[PDB]
């Protein structure tokens, strides 16, 4: 959708251990514009590879961005050259690291940052109201429509609330898109714990408590335990894992949780030459999905040949599934499903 999640956090909370784990680890694809770009870790790839035996395997990517600058008075601070807020502006969602062990209600911590986001949005909202008012006083119908949206979010921002928590409809969103409001960015909590934190943890519970209220995802990592795995060899690490019920780097969970947060889904193409993960927004039709591969699919699309991920696996590839009849022709309004194995036609 834009493809950036910004990692934010209070000064002593592991943001750093976590974003370095993420940077270390960034088949035959060379991605090298990577101030936080990583390959999506997706075990569907290898599972597909096992059936298909492709020469190459091409995951997709997730971009994370480590938000520079100081938090404590970001809103006032910006006039002084603080970039916390502008940095957040260049992203599409927010992964919000919360210290979830001792050395204080987690809410106070989370509030420290949300205050500064709401305060900046308030200032935007107030300044907009002044301009849009004078347009509307002059009969300007669009400006009356935006203003009325401003006037719904204003008192929410006055009270440190999030624009994302206001039930605005699509027309309403559409009209305020251009403000690039910070408190409208989707967010998930990255609850950072001790290598022994997952368990009976009053902190982590209170964060889950807080998230439940606003529909938010919470993803526990131990950035301690996570930063370890990260300065071992390619493979000189396997034996490190098993030692508990984490079957993979708990980091892979944060990568996938942020890919979701940006509303992204994967579909796959699979053949003897390659298995590739392809990114589209949730709810894309096949033609939108397809246009990701080539731009003439927009107009040129004829059909999608589609197998549900679960069938491709079960029936061992495309001739299996065909045999079992799980190989569908789908059309212009088919809504791509997570992990569909697709082949697109622009000829018979």
Residues of each annotated binding site: 12-17, 30
Strands 217-221 and 56-58: unpaired
Residue with structure tokens 């020469």? 55
Which of 56, 322, 255, 316 lies closest to 266, judged by CA? Answer: 255
- Per the annotation, binding residues for ATP are 12-17
Asked if 301 and 328 touch (Cβ cutoff 8 Å), the reply is no
- Per the annotation, binding residues for Mg(2+) are 16, 30
DSSP 242: T
The C-alpha atoms of residue 260 and residue 278 are separated, in whole angstroms, by 14
Provide the strand spans (E) within the chain.
4-8, 37-39, 56-58, 61-66, 93-99, 187-192, 217-221, 264-270, 274-281, 303-307, 328-330, 341-345
Radius of gyration of the chain (CA): 23
């Amino acid at each position: 959708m834009g493809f950036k999640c910004g990692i934010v956090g209070l000064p002593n909370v592991g943001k750093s251990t976590l974003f370095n784990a993420l940077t270390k680890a960034g088949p035959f694809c060379t991605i090298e514009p990577n101030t936080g770009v990583v390959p999506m870790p997706d075990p569907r790839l290898d599972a597909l590879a096992e059936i298909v035996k492709p020469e190459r395997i091409l995951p997709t990517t997730m971009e994370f961005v480590d938000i520079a600058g100081l938090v404590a008075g970001a809103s006032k601070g910006e006039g002084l050259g603080n970039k916390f807020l502008a940095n957040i502006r260049e992203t599409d969602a927010i992964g919000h690291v919360v210290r979830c062990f001792e050395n204080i209600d987690p809410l106070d911590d989370i509030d420290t940052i949300n205050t500064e986001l709401a305060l900046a949005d308030l200032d935007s909202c107030e300044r907009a109201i002044q301009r849009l008012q004078k347009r509307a006083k002059g009969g300007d119908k669009e400006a009356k429509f935006e203003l009325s949206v401003m006037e719904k979010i204003l008192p929410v921002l006055e009270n440190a609330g999030m624009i994302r928590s206001v039930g605005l409809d699509k027309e309403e969103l559409q009209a305020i898109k251009s403000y690039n409001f910070l408190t409208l960015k989707p967010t998930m909590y990255i609850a950072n714990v001790n290598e022994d934190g997952f368990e009976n943890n009053p902190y982590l519970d209170r964060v889950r408590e807080i998230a439940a209220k606003e529909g938010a995802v919470v993803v526990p990592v131990c950035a301690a335990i996570e930063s370890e795995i990260a300065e071992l060899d390619d493979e000189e690490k396997v034996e490190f894992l098993q030692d508990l019920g984490i079957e993979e780097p708990g980091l892979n969970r944060v990568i996938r949780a942020g890919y979701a947060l940006l509303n992204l889904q994967t579909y796959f193409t699979a053949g003897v030459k390659e298995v590739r993960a392809w990114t589209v927004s949730v709810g894309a039709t096949a033609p939108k999905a397809a246009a990701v591969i080539h731009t003439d699919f927009e107009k040129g699309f004829i059909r999608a040949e589609v197998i549900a991920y679960e069938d491709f696996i079960q029936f061992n590839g495309e001739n299996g599934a065909k045999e079992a009849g799980k190989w569908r022709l789908e059309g212009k309004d088919y809504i791509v499903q997570d992990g569909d194995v697709m082949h697109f036609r622009f000829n018979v």
